Amino acid sequence: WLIKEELEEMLVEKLSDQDYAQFIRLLERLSALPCGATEEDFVNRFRRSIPXXXXXXXXXXXXXXXXGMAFSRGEGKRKTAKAEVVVYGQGSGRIDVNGVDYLLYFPVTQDREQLMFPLHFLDRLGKHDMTCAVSGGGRSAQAGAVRLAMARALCSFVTEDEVEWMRQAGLLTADPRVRERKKPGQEGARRKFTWKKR
């Protein structure tokens, strides 16, 4: 149904909430009965239509000319740190980061687990071969950016169904969480200078 503002525009008249409510109530009474032709037109005046769109946008794959092989290139961004991950569809399990091996670039076990997440999800763990370039921020931020980029580059080689799973696993959604600016007259953006009653 129209908003209150749209009926206000249609009649060139200020309205009250109660009034709007009364009317819409009446249009429900109208829809409640057998619907004639002019009846339907009438209620169509007060009808509007709204869009809804949900799909993770699917990149068509890209077959490289050199080996004749297909790859997909993802970009994740988390918290001062961006990563790009090219995933090759036929792998040895090789995963290279900034030109060095992923074990050496993430000596923190936790990070390697984060990395393992999408691949262990899609059971592809050995199947794929990834090249990686990441910059900005500290280690966990980096491992997470690679998580996002990878899980993004992994939806070319996955089935249309597993995509909604990765969404509900929350893999492809960015982390909105970031540092909050200190505020002046305070300490930590939240933390305040110790307050004195006396």
Next chain:
Amino acid sequence: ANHLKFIARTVMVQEGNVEGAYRTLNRILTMDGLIEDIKRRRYYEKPCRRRQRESYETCRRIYNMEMARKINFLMRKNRADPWQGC
């Protein structure tokens, strides 16, 4: 004390449920006004301070009676309304 015992204020529990039978006896005493009287009679209450109680009670009973009636009279018209959005 001169009366035969166990005839007065006696419930006998049926099918062995005690709590139910106690609720029952309680409903007896409270229906007859004995609980309000025990509680009243823990301490004294002076004659004046008693007519005040009486009168406040009886006013309040009148009000609630009337208001009840009025409510149950207007009850019909609680029905969902015919003329809406005239």
